[PDB]
């Protein structure tokens, strides 16, 4: 029953959403990173001053080594691990047990967060992306694959609202839970499996188009990925972005390192002068040709709790992080090669304005594609 997985997702803003899941037998508690910009089921394995727990291998009766070694590399550090197989289960989720592989962290660098309370990372994207290649079968192609459980999952993003504040949601998987969303859903096209790649085809700052070749919104790619804090953006519409909301705001202005999403801004207790800032739509690609789709964010998506700019610019294509995700319910249709939009039933909004998903729009699109 999906009532069971009702705010089954735990955090602190900024720092990632988890889940909890228990890996061996007996069963060993940890909390995990929900990440649809990945597909490695990687776990701390050995003592680091971040982690307040591990896995622990020579613990578990049912694992199996694979002799194998994973090495991961990125700009800023790394994590490194060996590769093995045994019994995983979401206490919250479907009540099932699958034979995954699993990579035991035992040495990294600026993977793990301080405070952040999740030992590991569920990486729920696809294969192709795997590593230490395509091989490696995902977490969730292993769940299918052994039980009755749909190819699909979906996210309820919930954000803070009203330490670092505490931030929560829902992941269900093998369904859609109706209770979480109001009114339509829309659907935008997988483009292909690798990342959950999608086709943006218009942005507008306050309903006023930002008048691009669509080419330069997927500039490289656009992919929808829980693992992201900002709403990234390429360099190019970054800059007409920000141009566009200094101007929406221009009744007293920030410093520049808050536009660099370095620095915070604050008022005090309920006098946020939301109404200042403009709303943000992204256009998707809709199921039929000629036909589009808006998801509308408010400031209260796009300015993170004081507040910093959670907009930055991106030199790896369009990130619609959990910025965008925390205005909607999103379901990521694997068996259907889609990803649909619906207005959430927890997102932050004021009396005046609220996130939107709304369409059909027609856009004349099939070139959009970078
Ligand atoms: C607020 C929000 O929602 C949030 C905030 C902080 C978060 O913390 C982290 C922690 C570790 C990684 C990481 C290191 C190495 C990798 C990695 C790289 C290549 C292949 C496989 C992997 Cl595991 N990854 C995963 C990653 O790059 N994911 C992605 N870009 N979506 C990424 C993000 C997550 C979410």
């Keep these: 029953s999906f009532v069971e997985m009702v705010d089954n997702l735990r955090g602190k803003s900024g720092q990632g959403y ?14 995990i990173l929900v990440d649809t910009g990945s597909s490695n089921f990687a776990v701390g394995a050995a003592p680091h001053p971040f982690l307040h727990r591990y896995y622990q ?15 991961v590399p990125y700009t800023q550090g790394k994590w490194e691990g060996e590769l093995g197989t045994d019994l995983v289960s979401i206490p919250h989720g479907p009540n099932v047990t699958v034979r ?45 694959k052994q039980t009755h459980v749909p190819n699909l999952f979906s996210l309820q993003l919930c954000g803070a609202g009203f ?50 070749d669509c080419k330069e919104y997927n500039y490289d790619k656009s992919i929808v990925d829980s693992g992201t804090t900002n709403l990234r953006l390429p360099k190019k519409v970054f800059e007409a972005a920000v141009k566009s909301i200094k101007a929406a705001s221009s009744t007293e202005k920030f410093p520049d390192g808050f536009w660099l999403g370095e620095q915070l801004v604050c008022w005090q207790a309920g006098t946020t002068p939301w109404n200042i800032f403009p709303v943000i739509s992204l256009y998707l ?11 509308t964010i408010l400031p209260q998506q796009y300015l993170r709790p004081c507040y910093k700019f959670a907009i930055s ?42 996130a939107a998903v709304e369409g059909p729009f027609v856009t004349l699109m099939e070139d959009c594609g970078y």
């Design 18 to 31: 988890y889940v909890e899941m228990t890996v061996g037998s007996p069963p060993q508690t940890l909390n």
């Design 57 to 71: 291998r020579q613990l578990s009766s049912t694992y199996r080594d694979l002799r194998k070694g994973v090495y």
């Design 100 to 144: 995954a592989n699993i990579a035991a962290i035992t040495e990294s660098d600026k993977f793990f967060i301080n405070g952040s309370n999740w030992e590991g990372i569920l990486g729920l994207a696809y294969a192709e992306i795997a590593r230490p290649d395509d091989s490696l079968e995902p977490f969730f192609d292993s769940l299918v």
């Design 163 to 212: 330490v670092l504040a505490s931030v929560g949601g829902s992941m269900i998987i093998g369904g859609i839970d109706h209770s979480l969303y109001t009114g339509s859903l829309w659907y935008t096209p997988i483009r292909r499996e690798w990342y959950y790649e999608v086709i943006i085809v218009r942005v507008e700052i306050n309903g006023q188009d930002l008048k691009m």
């Design 285 to 295: 690609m809709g199921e039929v040709t000629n036909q589009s789709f808006r998801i």
């Design 313 to 354: 610019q991106s030199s790896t294509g369009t990130v619609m992080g959990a910025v965008i995700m925390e205005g909607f319910y999103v379901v990521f249709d694997r068996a259907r090669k889609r990803i649909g939009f619906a207005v959430s039933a927890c997102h932050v909004h004021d009396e005046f304005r609220t």
